Design a protein around this ligand. Structure first.
Ligand code: YDJ
Ligand code: CL
Ligand code: CL
Ligand code: CL
Ligand code: CL
Ligand code: CL
Length: 253
């Protein structure tokens, strides 16, 4: 396909993360310049892979990570090629922000803009009937301009009650993972459901218990993230409704 990149245009560097592993890289480009890339390994069957990557490579949105292509080193081991992001994942960034060494205290207006950015990304993927299935702040990347894009597309405390039960997954389960992500950002990196263990989570949710309003968090913001966890998927808003709720709340500060 036009998605496959020659292994010779790619030089692999140091390991950055674990998701097999994700590496630093140089991509040699059509214009003779080299581009900083992240290279992530993957766990025939590769035809369905290449075909999915070919599909994702057509994505174009500031708040979705570009898939620049795929390499196959040879047993074939394929590798997803992505623009390198020195600011790393959101979750780590939030934790670092609570240290004096790390980034400055993040004001709420900036925390809401992270949420708007993810909403915009998920709005765009949702429209093309693409399901993420692993939305969480650890899988949102920060670009050099500090804009957030959604990533690592294709964790029980992010799985929506209907997906825990029936092994069903719709865009509305993605909306559930989005509210948990909104909570991770409002809490600046707390694990969801403190004092509840992974095995207790289905029964905790089944008895109607939800993520608790964070201490900083605005009531209006907590109403938006609470709407993402309504029992019936059909009663949850769409990403397009959510994006505009958040855009409108951000406008009023
Ligand atoms: N694209 C890019 O630069 N990637 C990328 C870059 C990372 C990174 C960038 C600068 C410093 C550093 F320590 C890590 S980490 C990472 C990545 O893809 N992490 C994944 C691990 C699996 C779960 N979600 C985050
Ligand atoms: Cl290499
Ligand atoms: Cl950083
Ligand atoms: Cl509750
Ligand atoms: Cl909680
Ligand atoms: Cl509460």
């Amino acid at each position: 396909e036009d998605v496959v990149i020659d292994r010779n245009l790619l030089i692999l560097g140091k390991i950055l993360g674990e998701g097999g592993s994700v590496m630093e890289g140089n991509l040699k480009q059509e214009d003779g310049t080299s581009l900083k890339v992240a290279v992530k390994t993957m766990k025939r069957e590769i035809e369905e892979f290449l075909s999915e990557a070919a599909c994702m490579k057509d994505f174009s949105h500031p708040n979705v990570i570009r898939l620049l292509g795929v390499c196959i080193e040879m047993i074939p081991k394929p590798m997803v090629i992505l623009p390198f992001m020195k600011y790393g994942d959101l979750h780590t960034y939030l934790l670092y922000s609570r240290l004096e060494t790390g980034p400055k205290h993040i004001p709420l207006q900036t925390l809401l803009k992270f949420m708007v950015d993810i909403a915009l990304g998920m709005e765009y993927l949702s429209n093309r009937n693409f399901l993420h299935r692993d939305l969480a702040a650890r899988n949102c990347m920060l670009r050099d301009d500090m804009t957030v894009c959604v990533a690592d597309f294709g964790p029980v405390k992010w799985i929506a009650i209907e997906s825990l039960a029936d092994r069903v997954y719709t865009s509305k389960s993605d909306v559930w993972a989005f509210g948990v992500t909104m909570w991770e950002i409002a809490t600046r990196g707390m694990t969801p459901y403190p004092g509840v263990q992974n095995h207790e989570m289905y029964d905790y949710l089944l008895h109607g218990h939800r993520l608790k309003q964070p201490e900083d968090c605005l009531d209006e913001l907590y109403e938006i993230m609470y709407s993402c966890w309504r029992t019936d998927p059909l009663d949850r808003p769409t990403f397009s409704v959510l994006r505009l709720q958040l855009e409108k709340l951000l406008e009023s500060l």
